[PDB]
mmCIF file of C-alpha atoms in Angstrom:
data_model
loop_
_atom_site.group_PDB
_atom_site.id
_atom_site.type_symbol
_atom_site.label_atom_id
_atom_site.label_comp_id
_atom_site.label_asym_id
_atom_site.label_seq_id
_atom_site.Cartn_x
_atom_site.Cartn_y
_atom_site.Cartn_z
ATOM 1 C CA UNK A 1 95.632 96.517 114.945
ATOM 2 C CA UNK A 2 99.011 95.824 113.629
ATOM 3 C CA UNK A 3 102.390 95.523 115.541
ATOM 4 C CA UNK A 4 103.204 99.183 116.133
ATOM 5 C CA UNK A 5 107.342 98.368 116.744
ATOM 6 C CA UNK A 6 109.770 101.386 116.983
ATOM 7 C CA UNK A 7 111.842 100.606 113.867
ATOM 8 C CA UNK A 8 110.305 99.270 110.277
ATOM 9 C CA UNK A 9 111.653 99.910 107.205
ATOM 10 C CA UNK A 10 109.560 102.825 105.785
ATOM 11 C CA UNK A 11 109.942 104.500 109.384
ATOM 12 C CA UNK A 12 113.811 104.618 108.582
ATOM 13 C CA UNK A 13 113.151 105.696 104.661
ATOM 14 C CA UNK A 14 110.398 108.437 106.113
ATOM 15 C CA UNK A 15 113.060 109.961 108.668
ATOM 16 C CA UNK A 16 115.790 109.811 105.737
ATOM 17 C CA UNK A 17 113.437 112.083 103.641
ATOM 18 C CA UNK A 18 112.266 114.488 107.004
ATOM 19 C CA UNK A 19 116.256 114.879 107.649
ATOM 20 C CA UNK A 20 117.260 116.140 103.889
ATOM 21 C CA UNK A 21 113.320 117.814 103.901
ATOM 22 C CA UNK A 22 113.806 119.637 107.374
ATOM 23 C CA UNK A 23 117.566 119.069 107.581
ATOM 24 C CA UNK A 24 120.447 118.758 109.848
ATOM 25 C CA UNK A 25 118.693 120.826 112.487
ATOM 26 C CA UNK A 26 115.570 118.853 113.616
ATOM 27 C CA UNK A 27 118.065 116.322 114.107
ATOM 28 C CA UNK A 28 116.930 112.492 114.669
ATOM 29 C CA UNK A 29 114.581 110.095 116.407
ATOM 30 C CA UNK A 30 116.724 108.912 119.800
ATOM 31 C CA UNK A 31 116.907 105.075 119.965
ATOM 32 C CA UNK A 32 114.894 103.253 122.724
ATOM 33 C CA UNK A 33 110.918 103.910 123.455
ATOM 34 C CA UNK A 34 109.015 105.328 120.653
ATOM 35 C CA UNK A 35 111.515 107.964 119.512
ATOM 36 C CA UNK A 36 109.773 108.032 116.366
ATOM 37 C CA UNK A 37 106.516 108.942 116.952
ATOM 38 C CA UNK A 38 107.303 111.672 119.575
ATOM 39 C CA UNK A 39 109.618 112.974 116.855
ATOM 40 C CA UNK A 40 106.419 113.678 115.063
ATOM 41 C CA UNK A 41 104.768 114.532 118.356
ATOM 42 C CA UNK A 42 104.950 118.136 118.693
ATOM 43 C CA UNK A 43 104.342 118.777 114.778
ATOM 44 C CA UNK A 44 107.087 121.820 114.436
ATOM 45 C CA UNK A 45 108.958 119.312 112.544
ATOM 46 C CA UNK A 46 105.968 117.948 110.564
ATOM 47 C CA UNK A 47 104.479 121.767 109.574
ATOM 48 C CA UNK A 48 108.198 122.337 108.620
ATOM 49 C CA UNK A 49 108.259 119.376 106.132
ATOM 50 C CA UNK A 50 104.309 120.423 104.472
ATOM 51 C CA UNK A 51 106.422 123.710 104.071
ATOM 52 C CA UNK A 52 109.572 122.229 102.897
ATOM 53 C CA UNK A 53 107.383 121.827 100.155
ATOM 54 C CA UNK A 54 104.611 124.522 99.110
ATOM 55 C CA UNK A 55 105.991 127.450 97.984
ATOM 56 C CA UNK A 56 107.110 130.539 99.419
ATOM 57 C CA UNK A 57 104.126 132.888 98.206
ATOM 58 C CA UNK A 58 101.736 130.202 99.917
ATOM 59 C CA UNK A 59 103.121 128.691 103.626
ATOM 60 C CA UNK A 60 100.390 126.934 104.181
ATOM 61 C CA UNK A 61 101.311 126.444 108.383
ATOM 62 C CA UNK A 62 102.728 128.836 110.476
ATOM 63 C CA UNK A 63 106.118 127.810 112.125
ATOM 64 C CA UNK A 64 107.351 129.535 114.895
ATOM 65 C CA UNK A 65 110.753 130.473 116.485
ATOM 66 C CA UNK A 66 110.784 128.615 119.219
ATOM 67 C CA UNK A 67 108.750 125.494 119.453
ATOM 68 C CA UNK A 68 105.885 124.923 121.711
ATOM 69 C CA UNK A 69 105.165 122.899 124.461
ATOM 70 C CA UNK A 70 101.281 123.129 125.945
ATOM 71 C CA UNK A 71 99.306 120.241 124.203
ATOM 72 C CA UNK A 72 96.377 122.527 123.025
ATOM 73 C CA UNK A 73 99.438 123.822 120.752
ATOM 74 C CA UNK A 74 101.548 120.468 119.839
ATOM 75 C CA UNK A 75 97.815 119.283 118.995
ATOM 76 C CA UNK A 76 97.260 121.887 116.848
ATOM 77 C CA UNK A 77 100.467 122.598 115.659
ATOM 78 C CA UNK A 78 100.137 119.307 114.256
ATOM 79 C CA UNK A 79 96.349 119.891 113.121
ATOM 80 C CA UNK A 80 97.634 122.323 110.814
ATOM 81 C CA UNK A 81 100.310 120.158 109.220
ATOM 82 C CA UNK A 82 97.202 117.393 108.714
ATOM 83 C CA UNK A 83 94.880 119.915 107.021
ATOM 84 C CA UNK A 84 97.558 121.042 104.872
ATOM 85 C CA UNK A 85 98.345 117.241 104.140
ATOM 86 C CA UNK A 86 95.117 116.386 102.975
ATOM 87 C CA UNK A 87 95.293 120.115 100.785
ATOM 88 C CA UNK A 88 97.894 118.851 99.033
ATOM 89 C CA UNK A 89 96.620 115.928 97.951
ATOM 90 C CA UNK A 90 96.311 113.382 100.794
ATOM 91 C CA UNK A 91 92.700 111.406 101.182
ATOM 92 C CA UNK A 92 90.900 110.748 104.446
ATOM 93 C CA UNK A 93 92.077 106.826 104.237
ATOM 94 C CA UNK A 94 95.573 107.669 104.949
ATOM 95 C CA UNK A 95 95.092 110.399 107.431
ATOM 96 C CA UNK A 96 95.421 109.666 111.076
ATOM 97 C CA UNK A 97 93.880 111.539 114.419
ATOM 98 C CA UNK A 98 96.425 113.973 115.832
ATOM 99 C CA UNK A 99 96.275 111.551 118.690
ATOM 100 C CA UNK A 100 97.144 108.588 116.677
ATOM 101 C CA UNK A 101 100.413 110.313 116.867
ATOM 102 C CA UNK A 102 100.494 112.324 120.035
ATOM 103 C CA UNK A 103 99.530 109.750 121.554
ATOM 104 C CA UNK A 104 100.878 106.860 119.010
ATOM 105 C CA UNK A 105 97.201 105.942 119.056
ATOM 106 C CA UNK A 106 98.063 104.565 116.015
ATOM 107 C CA UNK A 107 101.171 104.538 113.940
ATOM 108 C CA UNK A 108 100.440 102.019 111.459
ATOM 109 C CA UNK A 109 98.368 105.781 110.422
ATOM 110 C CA UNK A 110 101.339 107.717 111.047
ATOM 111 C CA UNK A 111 102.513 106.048 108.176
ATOM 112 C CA UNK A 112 99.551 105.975 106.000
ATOM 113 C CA UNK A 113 99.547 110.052 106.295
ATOM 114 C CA UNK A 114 103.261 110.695 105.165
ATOM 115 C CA UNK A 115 103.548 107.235 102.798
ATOM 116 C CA UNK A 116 101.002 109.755 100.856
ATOM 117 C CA UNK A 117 102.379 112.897 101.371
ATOM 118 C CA UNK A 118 105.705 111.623 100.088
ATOM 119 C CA UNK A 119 104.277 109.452 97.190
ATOM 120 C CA UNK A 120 102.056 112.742 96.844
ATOM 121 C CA UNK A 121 105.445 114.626 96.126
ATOM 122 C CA UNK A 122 107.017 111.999 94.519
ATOM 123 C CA UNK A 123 103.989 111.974 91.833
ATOM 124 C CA UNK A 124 104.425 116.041 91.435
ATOM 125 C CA UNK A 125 108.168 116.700 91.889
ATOM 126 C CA UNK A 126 108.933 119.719 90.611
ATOM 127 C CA UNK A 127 111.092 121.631 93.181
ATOM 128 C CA UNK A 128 110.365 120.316 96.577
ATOM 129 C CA UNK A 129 111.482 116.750 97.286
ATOM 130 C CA UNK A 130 115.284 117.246 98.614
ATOM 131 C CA UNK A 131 115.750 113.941 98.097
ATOM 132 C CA UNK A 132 114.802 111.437 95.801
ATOM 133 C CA UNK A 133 111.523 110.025 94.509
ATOM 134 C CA UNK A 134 112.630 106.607 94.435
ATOM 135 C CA UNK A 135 112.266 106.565 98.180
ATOM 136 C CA UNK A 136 108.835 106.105 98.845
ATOM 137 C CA UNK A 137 107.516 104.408 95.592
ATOM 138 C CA UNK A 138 107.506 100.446 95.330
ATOM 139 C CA UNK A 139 104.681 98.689 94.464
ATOM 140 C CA UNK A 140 101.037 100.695 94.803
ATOM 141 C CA UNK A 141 98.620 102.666 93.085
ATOM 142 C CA UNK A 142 99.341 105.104 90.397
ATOM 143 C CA UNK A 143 97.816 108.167 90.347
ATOM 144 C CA UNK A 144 93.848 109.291 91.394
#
């Protein structure tokens, strides 16, 4: 199902917007092997960008101190990045399985679940979005 190559163009975009989203703390994907999609693996980073956004009388996740480690957690750490997702806006076509990215099942999905969640906040934009919206948008569907 689709080439799933460590590089792509959106993949670059996506981390541009999780850098100025998260900042210069989470730091970056590290070249060679996936990189990537363990840099979404253990979710801290991926809660902290849902948050990035909602407000600060809602914080939808709950992000820790330190991060975790045990997979139960990462899993669900992530889980409760992908619920809020879909909150926000996201559908049930572009959401993946938490193993689709633990386990890069799948990260054609990977994709499908953030190019929404950005698009999402590119469509709103109103105080979240430390970037630009002209990052995700292109050529799609406009609003539903």
């Amino acid at each position: 199902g689709s080439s799933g190559s460590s590089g792509e163009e959106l993949e670059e975009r996506l981390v541009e917007w999780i850098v100025v989203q998260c900042g210069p703390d989470v730091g970056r994907p590290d070249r060679g092997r996936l990189g990537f999609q363990v840099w979404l693996k253990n979710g801290v980073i991926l809660s902290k960008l849902v948050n990035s956004l909602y407000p600060e009388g809602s914080k939808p996740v709950k992000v820790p101190e330190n991060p975790p480690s045990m997979v139960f957690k990462q899993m669900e750490q992530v889980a409760q990045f992908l619920k809020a997702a879909e909150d926000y806006g996201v559908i049930k076509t572009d959401m993946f399985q938490t193993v689709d990215l633990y386990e890069g099942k799948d990260m054609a999905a990977v994709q499908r679940t953030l190019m929404a969640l950005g698009s999402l906040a590119v469509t709103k934009n109103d105080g979240n979005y430390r970037g630009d919206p002209n990052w995700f948008m292109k050529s799609g569907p406009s609003s539903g």
